[PDB]
Enzyme design. Structure first.
Site, PDB file in Angstrom:
ATOM      1  CB  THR A 267      -0.968   0.005   1.194  1.00  0.00           C
ATOM      2  OG1 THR A 267      -0.227  -0.085   2.413  1.00  0.00           O
ATOM      3  CG2 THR A 267      -1.975  -1.121   1.145  1.00  0.00           C
ATOM      4  CG  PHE A 392      -6.879   5.733   4.497  1.00  0.00           C
ATOM      5  CD1 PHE A 392      -5.803   4.868   4.473  1.00  0.00           C
ATOM      6  CD2 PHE A 392      -6.654   7.069   4.233  1.00  0.00           C
ATOM      7  CE1 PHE A 392      -4.521   5.331   4.235  1.00  0.00           C
ATOM      8  CE2 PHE A 392      -5.376   7.532   3.970  1.00  0.00           C
ATOM      9  CZ  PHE A 392      -4.305   6.663   3.973  1.00  0.00           C
ATOM     10  CB  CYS A 399      -6.873   2.104   6.522  1.00  0.00           C
ATOM     11  SG  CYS A 399      -5.131   1.635   6.678  1.00  0.00           S
TER      12      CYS A 399
HETATM   13  C1  LIG Z   1      -7.182  -3.458   1.416  1.00  0.00           C
HETATM   14  C2  LIG Z   1      -6.000  -3.719   1.914  1.00  0.00           C
HETATM   15  C3  LIG Z   1      -5.457  -5.033   2.312  1.00  0.00           C
HETATM   16  C4  LIG Z   1      -4.372  -5.139   3.183  1.00  0.00           C
HETATM   17  C5  LIG Z   1      -3.849  -6.372   3.539  1.00  0.00           C
HETATM   18  C6  LIG Z   1      -4.409  -7.530   3.045  1.00  0.00           C
HETATM   19  C7  LIG Z   1      -5.486  -7.453   2.190  1.00  0.00           C
HETATM   20  C8  LIG Z   1      -6.003  -6.219   1.824  1.00  0.00           C
END
Ligand SMILES: C=Cc1ccccc1
Ligand SMILES: O=C(CCCCC1CCCCC1)N[C@@H](Cc1ccccc1)C(=O)O
Ligand SMILES: [Cl-]
Length: 454
Positions: A267, A392, A399
């Site tokens: 990310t 997010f 998030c």
């Molecule tokens: C949407 C972000 C995300 C982060 C870690 C694993 C799978 C999805």
């Protein structure tokens, strides 16, 4: 009450062959451009509705009407991320328990503690680029992924991936990347039980076993030593949910560590890569950001307080998340029968997909200049309509890493703008690679040192 459009079909396979591409999110963006704010997408035994307008997305973000859904992508990732925070249902005990335990770890005492380890990795990146020869370039997404993986390893469980010492990934990362590739590739398989996928299935189980074996060893070694680092693993081993009074079990801690390493790899590295892309394509914006970095970062090592003062750098990062949100979709389900937008009746359980890059291009929100990179759009959050900006996600399932990611990205981009001038020496044509997330592929630049010591 009206019928929603649907893109072209392929007989019994319905819309499934539209996602037989290495760039499915960009394909869905083109379908949204053609069909508008909402379209139906059908595959054998599955229906979802893609939303693109702030008009419909502001309704979808009502937590009284819609809860987080696991997309087929997240259901496939759950084979290795288990009931970690991102692949858990809101109603699973382990979601709220882990959320309650981890929230204090992710707050704005918490970033002050992680700052020193983020500086350690940021300094490694700056020293790498200072040490390049005149005739050399930077592979941007490659170096940003080295940085963000190293940062979450140090902050997650006091582990050095030493990504700047390597061409070839750590064995955990080989298995993690290959498991993520298999999970995303499985989305486009019409016949997943075909024997031609038997090798893929065997390799997937091997990669799951590797990730479980290596993370379970980290947890065991920490418990054995008694060591009390200021890291997420210490918080997870010591933390008690205020509701239940219970700690997380070792299996769930393993799923949280796997989850954090996926996020750290996928990310923030995309955000930094897109931010540098937009800065080199918009030299007036780069100059304004570099002037802020020079004025604020007056010490050899940035402090936590100085990173908080890089306001314009923060706006640059938000404007990169607007045009290319690196996590480009999230999924919702209707908690009850309901009408979306006064036009689209939904039944309890019906699935929605929020197409974040399309939301972020709604001209009724952002104006005619929606394709232009203008960080000044973010000067006043009160001037931005509700639910217009969702990089997010939404509500209680937003998030948990938002402040961590933006702190790391602000620190690193600040130091990059302080220490180097940048040249788009190839006139790079944006090519977006899709894994779990979006990243520029093949993005290269030349850095010219300002020769300012660390
Ligand atoms: C949407 C972000 C995300 C982060 C870690 C694993 C799978 C999805
Ligand atoms: O929208 C997509 C393709 C891009 C997801 C990208 C998404 C994955 C998580 C991290 C954020 C980005 N998939 C839907 C619909 C679907 C279902 C089965 C087979 C094919 C498509 C799903 O995964 O439910
Ligand atoms: Cl057809």
């Amino acid at each position: 009450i009206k019928e929603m459009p649907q893109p072209k079909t392929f007989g019994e396979l319905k819309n499934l062959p539209l996602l037989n591409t290495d760039k499915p999110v960009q394909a869905l963006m083109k379908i949204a451009d053609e069909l508008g704010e909402i379209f139906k997408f059908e595959a054998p035994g599955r229906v979802t509705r893609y939303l693109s307008s702030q008009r419909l997305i502001k309704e979808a973000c009502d937590e009284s009407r819609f809860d987080k859904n696991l997309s087929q992508a997240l259901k496939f990732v759950r084979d290795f991320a288990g009931d970690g925070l991102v692949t858990s249902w809101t109603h699973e005990k382990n979601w709220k328990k882990a959320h309650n335990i981890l929230l204090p770890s992710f707050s704005q005492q918490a970033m002050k503690g992680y700052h020193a380890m983020m500086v350690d990795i940021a300094v490694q990146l700056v020293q790498k680029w200072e040490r390049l020869n005149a005739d050399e370039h930077i592979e941007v997404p490659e170096d940003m992924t080295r940085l963000t993986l190293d940062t979450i390893g140090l902050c997650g469980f006091n582990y050095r991936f030493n990504s700047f010492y390597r061409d070839q990934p750590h064995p955990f990362i080989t298995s993690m990347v290959r498991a993520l590739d298999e999970a995303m590739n499985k989305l486009q398989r019409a016949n997943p039980d075909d024997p031609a996928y038997d090798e893929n299935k065997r390799q997937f189980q091997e990669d799951i076993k590797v990730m479980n074996d290596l993370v379970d060893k980290i947890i065991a070694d920490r418990k054995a030593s008694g060591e009390q680092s200021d890291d997420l693993l210490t918080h997870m081993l010591n933390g008690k949910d205020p509701e239940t009074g219970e700690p997380l079990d070792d299996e769930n801690i393993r799923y949280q560590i796997i989850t954090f390493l996926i996020a750290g790899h996928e990310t923030t590295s995309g955000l930094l890569s897109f931010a540098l892309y937009f800065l080199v394509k918009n030299p007036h914006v780069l100059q304004k950001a570099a002037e802020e970095a020079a004025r604020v970062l007056v010490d050899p090592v940035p402090s936590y307080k100085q990173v908080k003062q890089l306001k314009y750098v923060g706006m640059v990062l938000n404007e990169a998340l607007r045009l290319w949100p690196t996590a480009p979709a999230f999924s919702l389900y209707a908690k009850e029968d309901t009408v979306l937008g006064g036009e689209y009746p939904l039944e309890k359980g019906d699935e929605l997909m929020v197409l974040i890059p399309q939301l972020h291009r709604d001209k009724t929100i952002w104006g005619d200049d929606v394709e232009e990179f203008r960080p000044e759009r973010f000067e006043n959050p009160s001037a931005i309509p509700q639910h217009a900006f969702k990089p997010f996600g939404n509500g209680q399932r937003a998030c948990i890493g938002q402040q961590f990611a933006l702190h790391e990205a602000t620190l690193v981009l600040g130091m990059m703008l302080k220490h180097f001038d940048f040249e788009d020496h190839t006139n790079y044509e944006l090519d977006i690679k899709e894994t779990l997330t979006l990243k520029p592929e093949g993005f290269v630049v030349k850095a010219k040192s300002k020769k300012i010591p660390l």
